């Protein structure tokens, strides 16, 4: 469907850490499997865990990461 990093309303990211124990709890709650965090160009460091439906938000592009 529509997949992405750990998102945050309206559409930006949530925060990982230099390590494995960054934000595993929230993203595994959202319905994620994988784990690692990579910078989102222009929008900030984010931790991708995969297989996310459209129920929780994702990284969406096109204009800016706005409020």
């Amino acid at each position: 469907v529509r997949d992405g990093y750990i998102a945050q309303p309206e559409n930006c990211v949530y925060h990982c850490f230099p390590g494995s124990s960054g934000c595993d709890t929230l993203c595994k709650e959202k319905g994620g499997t994988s784990g690692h965090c990579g910078f989102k160009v222009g929008h900030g460091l984010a931790c991708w865990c995969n297989a996310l439906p459209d129920n929780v938000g994702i990284i969406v592009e096109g204009e800016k990461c706005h409020s």
Binding site: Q8, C12, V13, H15, F39, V41, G42, H43, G44, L45, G62, E63, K64, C65, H66, S67
Partner: protein, 1085 residues
């Protein structure tokens, strides 16, 4: 032969011949579309110029002449006109590309006069010397342009599009997406009473649209597409405009509407710094010029004897001219017939006295020898003119007699010297300015004349000629003259609409740069040339408490708190009931604490000691006004008479703060200390302005009135339905036609003085002028251009009334201040080895320089791919700097410690690094996250100090740094004045009809709003706009009685106070800024 050519060339019939040839060419070139009949003299001119060139070549007398004799640049120009005329005539095929060059001849007079060569050469030398300061300046503008770009990128696009975007336009080929949300400005809203699309905004502070209107960002660019902040090139232009303050009030209102009220600081930072920079850059430029200078039958005989011996007639005669001048002053718009008849008689009576004196003067003295004295000759000329006038500029000949006071007045004589000096010793410079304006006027006309005429519908609001255009030579001179004033941007958009951006920018900027450079040089030249036991116990304790620091500080905090109370005294007080009761409770406490403070001072030093200080008297007056208001409330008989007025006067509470602040106290004392010196000069300006206002009244009283029907809002057909004021009344069967005079006009001498001020300051002059130069008759409606030649009066006024007086004013201030002063670890080893080399530092600069280019390339919504690429580069760059700073942080053990700037570099990168990571909420809350990265550019300035080669930058940098502390101090006083005025303004100007400068966002209604209007007015921008709503009283434009929430009824503003409020404010700010910029500068050097 060669001998004969040399003999005939240096002959002096030649200089007059060629000069005459250029001069007739001027008069023919200035013509637009000359009739072919007289016109084809052109190739005869070609003959005279070719003949001259031939003579020059022959006089040098061989083939090497064109190698060793015509090396001179000014002759390359002659060869240019020759080859160009021949290329235009002998061959073609004619797309008219070359005919533009004909002006090149006009510089030949600069080639023939032996002085204009010297002057233009020295001027171009000076241009060459102002190079490095201009590079520093363009860099500063680049930096701030980026700042403005990233702050308001595309923000100036925002437009209140009609709420639409309903649903399923599939997608957007319907008006009733980007098709209609963009190219249907029938979807947008125009600002109130203007043809200008309304901006808007998402931010709470930013102005918002009316219900049913949506604030979308998709539209064409703002005014005309030439002021958009988005993209670096356009950002550089907008900032340049802010730096020179040319019509920046219009831009500032636009951006503050889109971005929000909170971005004012940007403009405040730019206007305050930019003007301070411009003043410093002019000062540096001025120093270079100064540096250059540094580097360098029985019965009749008996009768005559008696009169000549006994004099004593100047005292009586001087009084007569003073009275005469005051006599003509009485003339106003509607003098009664008896008075009108009486006024004429006085002039006739006055003329006889002067004529009689002239006759006596010639006989008593020598008719041939004594009369020759220059002063007497000019005096006689006035007398004959007056006789000629009696034998509407005809009656203004008498006004020249006011200058007779110069012998008895030290300062008027000084101004006379300046006018005389301009055409005298410094007369050569004046001529160059005249010729340069001419070259530009014909160059401008030749290049854009066809365009202005062909495409007038584009430039003009209605189907009529645009007010300012270059099609006519006279009109071209006005535009060139206007550019000298500093109002270049308004006209530049108009030429660009017809001409195209490429050409207009090259010439207008050239005119702006060249015209200002010569005008500044001429202006500066004139300036240089011009030069029991219980009682005892009580005294001890009271003296001690006042002396104690905490008590003094407590009062200082109290005054600031007291000042704060005034801020909440705006129109929203009824809504804010909780605060309202507190303010009332507070007011009483404030009055008491200050009165207690006053009594305490008396006990400590005694009445005699306390009263000696001026500040104590100042403190006393403020507490008395409050106490008087307080006693009136307690004693009864409230809400009557002038009690409201006493309440408005408590806006002077901030003044008490000046006494206890050491910075505010020193500046205030210096400003008032120099007031006596300023005062005599003000009289000279008043006298000089008096001549113009009186002259203006003869020329314009009653001519200005002109309104039409209420629906239109502008004058009716002049030669058609209404032609006269009397005719207007006859046709007023409907209530629609109101005959209303323009707000600011010369109808009275006092009214004339106000009108001159607007013209003198160059703000609001356009409305004064259009009413003035369209004047048709004494009571007749103004025709579109009828009586167009009046602009001459304003040009004459502007050159003499404002430019000379300001120069005189600057000179006396400079003179007064001078006299006043006079009167009184393998890796560690490697970094350590390589840190010293110059190249390593250079690499960082190149990356930073590259980074500047990376930010310089971004427009608004450039590309989906481009933003990602730019972002990747931007992300790479932040990492590069962080990596670089950390590795070099400890090259040496004390490396971080050695340089402060290196430590500062870590702070910007850490702020920047967190920004990207925390970017989710930062863009909305902060100005922008990308804006922080522009701080790295400022690091480049460090290299400027390092470079050995240019000393020009150092002077500008040193001047700014030395004078940096004082800018803050004047700025504080300015703010205090702004604070005082807004409070004064809030009581008086609340509920003023929203017309002109007062829109919805900029009002005097609230303190937040009042500060914005006052801030713009400090630099005089928009003062004319703000004043206009205040001035009008009564319909059609205003409403006499409209219910208001406060007791003040109706939306009309009071004229006596309104004129008083703005004019004093405009002058007070001018004195605060001029004295303080000048005092600091004089002290510094």
């Amino acid at each position: 032969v060669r001998r004969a050519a040399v003999k005939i060339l240096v002959h002096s019939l030649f200089s007059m011949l060629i000069m005459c040839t250029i001069l007739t060419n001027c008069v023919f070139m200035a013509q637009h579309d000359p009739p072919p009949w007289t016109k084809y003299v052109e190739y005869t001119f070609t003959a005279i110029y070719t003949f001259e060139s031939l003579v020059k070549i022959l006089a040098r007398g061989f083939c090497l002449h064109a190698f060793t004799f015509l090396r001179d640049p000014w002759n390359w120009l002659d060869f240019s006109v020759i080859v160009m005329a021949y290329t235009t005539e002998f061959v073609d095929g004619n797309v008219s590309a070359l005919r533009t060059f004909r002006v090149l001849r006009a510089l030949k007079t600069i080639s023939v006069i032996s002085g204009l060569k010297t002057i233009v050469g020295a001027l171009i030398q000076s241009v060459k010397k102002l190079a490095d300061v201009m590079v520093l300046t363009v860099f500063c503008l680049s930096v701030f342009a980026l700042i403005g770009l990233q702050l308001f990128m595309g923000n100036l696009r925002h437009k209140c599009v009609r709420n639409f975007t309903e649903l399923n336009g599939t997608n957007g080929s319907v008006e009733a997406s980007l098709d209609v949300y963009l190219n249907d400005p029938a979807n947008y809203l125009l600002k109130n009473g203007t043809t200008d699309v309304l901006l808007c905004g998402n931010s709470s502070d930013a102005g918002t649209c009316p219900e049913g209107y949506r604030c979308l960002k998709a539209g064409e660019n703002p005014d005309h597409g030439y002021t958009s902040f988005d993209s670096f090139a356009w950002a550089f232009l907008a900032l340049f405009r802010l730096m020179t303050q040319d019509c920046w009030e219009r831009l500032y209102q636009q951006t503050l509407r889109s971005a929000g009220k909170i971005y004012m600081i940007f403009f405040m930072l730019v206007i305050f710094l930019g003007s301070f920079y411009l003043v410093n850059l002019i000062l540096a430029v001025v120093a270079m010029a100064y540096e250059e200078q540094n580097q360098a039958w029985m019965s009749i005989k008996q009768k005559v004897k008696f009169v000549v011996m006994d004099p004593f007639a100047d005292l009586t005669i001087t009084m007569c001219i003073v009275l005469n001048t005051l006599f003509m002053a009485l003339e106003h718009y509607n003098m009664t017939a008896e008075f009108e008849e009486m006024l004429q008689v006085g002039n006739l009576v006055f003329t006889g006295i002067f004529t009689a004196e002239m006759t006596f003067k010639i006989i008593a003295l020598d008719p041939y020898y004594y009369f020759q004295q220059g002063w007497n000759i000019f005096d006689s000329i006035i007398v004959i003119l007056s006789l000629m006038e009696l034998g509407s500029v005809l009656r203004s000949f008498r006004l020249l007699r006011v200058f007779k006071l110069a012998k008895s007045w030290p300062t008027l004589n000084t101004l006379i010297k300046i006018i005389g000096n301009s055409v005298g010793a410094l007369g050569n410079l004046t001529l160059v300015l005249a010729i340069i304006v001419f070259i530009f006027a014909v160059v401008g006309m030749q290049l854009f004349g066809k365009n202005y005429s062909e495409l007038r519908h584009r430039i003009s609001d209605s189907g009529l000629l645009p007010r300012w255009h270059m099609m006519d030579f006279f009109h071209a001179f006005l535009i060139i003259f206007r550019i000298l004033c500093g109002e270049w941007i308004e006209t530049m958009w108009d030429c660009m609409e017809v001409s195209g951006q490429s050409l207009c920018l090259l010439v207008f900027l050239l005119v702006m740069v060249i015209g200002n450079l010569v005008v500044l040089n001429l202006f500066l030249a004139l300036l240089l040339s011009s030069f029991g036991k219980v009682w005892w116990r009580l005294r001890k304790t009271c003296y001690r408490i006042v002396e104690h620091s905490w008590f003094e500080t407590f009062i200082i905090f109290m005054i600031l708190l007291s000042s704060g109370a005034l801020a909440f005294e705006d129109i929203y007080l009824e809504e804010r009931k909780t605060i309202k009761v507190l303010l009332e409770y507070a007011d009483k406490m404030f009055t008491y604490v200050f009165v207690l403070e006053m009594l305490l001072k008396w006990v400590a030093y005694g009445f005699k000691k306390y009263f000696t200080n001026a500040w104590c008297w100042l403190d006393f007056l403020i507490v008395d006004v409050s106490l008087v208001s307080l006693v009136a409330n307690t004693l009864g008989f409230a809400e009557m008479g002038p009690i409201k007025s006493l309440r408005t006067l408590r806006a002077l509470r901030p003044l008490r703060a000046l006494s206890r602040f050491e910075g505010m106290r020193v500046v205030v004392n210096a400003l008032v200390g120099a007031i006596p010196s300023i005062m005599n000069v003000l009289l000279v300006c008043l006298i000089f302005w008096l001549i113009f206002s009186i002259m203006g009244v003869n020329l314009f009283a009653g001519k200005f009135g002109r309104c039409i029907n209420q629906t239109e809002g502008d004058l009716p057909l002049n030669y058609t339905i209404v032609n006269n004021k009397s005719e207007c009344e006859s046709f007023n069967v409907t209530g629609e036609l109101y005959w209303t005079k323009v707000k600011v006009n010369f109808d009275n001498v006092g009214a004339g003085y106000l009108a001159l001020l607007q013209v003198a300051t160059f703000k609001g002059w356009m409305d004064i002028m259009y009413a003035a130069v369209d004047s048709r008759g004494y009571e007749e409606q103004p025709q579109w251009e009828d009586n167009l030649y009046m602009y001459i009066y304003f040009v004459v006024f502007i050159i003499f009334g404002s430019f000379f007086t300001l120069n005189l004013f600057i000179g006396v201030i400079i003179d007064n201040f001078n006299q006043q002063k006079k009167k009184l670890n393998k890796y560690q080893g490697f970094i350590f080895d390589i840190v010293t080399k110059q190249a390593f530092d250079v690499t960082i600069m190149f990356l930073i320089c590259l980074n500047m280019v990376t930010m310089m390339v971004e427009t608004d919504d450039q590309s989906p791919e481009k933003v990602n690429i730019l972002a990747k580069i931007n992300l790479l760059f932040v990492a590069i700097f962080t990596g670089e700073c950390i590795v070099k942080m400890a090259a040496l053990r004390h490396y971080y410690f050695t340089n402060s700037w290196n430590i500062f570099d870590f702070v910007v990168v850490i702020l920047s690094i967190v920004g990207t990571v925390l970017s989710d909420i930062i863009q909305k809350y902060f100005f922008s996250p990308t804006l922080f990265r522009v701080i790295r550019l400022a690091r480049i300035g460090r290299i400027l100090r390092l470079i050995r080669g240019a000393k020009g930058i150092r002077t500008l940098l040193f001047a700014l740094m030395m004078s940096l502390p004082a800018l803050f101090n004047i700025g504080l006083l300015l703010f205090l004045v702004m604070f005082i005025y807004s409070i004064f303004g809030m009581a008086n100007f609340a509920y003023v009809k929203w017309e002109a400068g007062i829109d919805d966002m900029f009002n005097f209604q609230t303190f937040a709003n009042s500060m914005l209007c006052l801030f713009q007015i400090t630099t005089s921008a928009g003062w004319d706009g703000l004043l206009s709503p205040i001035l009008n009283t009564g319909p059609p434009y205003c409403d006499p009685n409209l219910p208001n929430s406060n007791g003040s009824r109706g939306n009309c503003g009071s004229p006596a106070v309104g004129i008083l409020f703005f004019t004093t404010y405009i002058i007070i700010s001018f004195l605060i800024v001029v004295n303080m910029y000048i005092a600091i500068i004089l002290e510094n050097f």
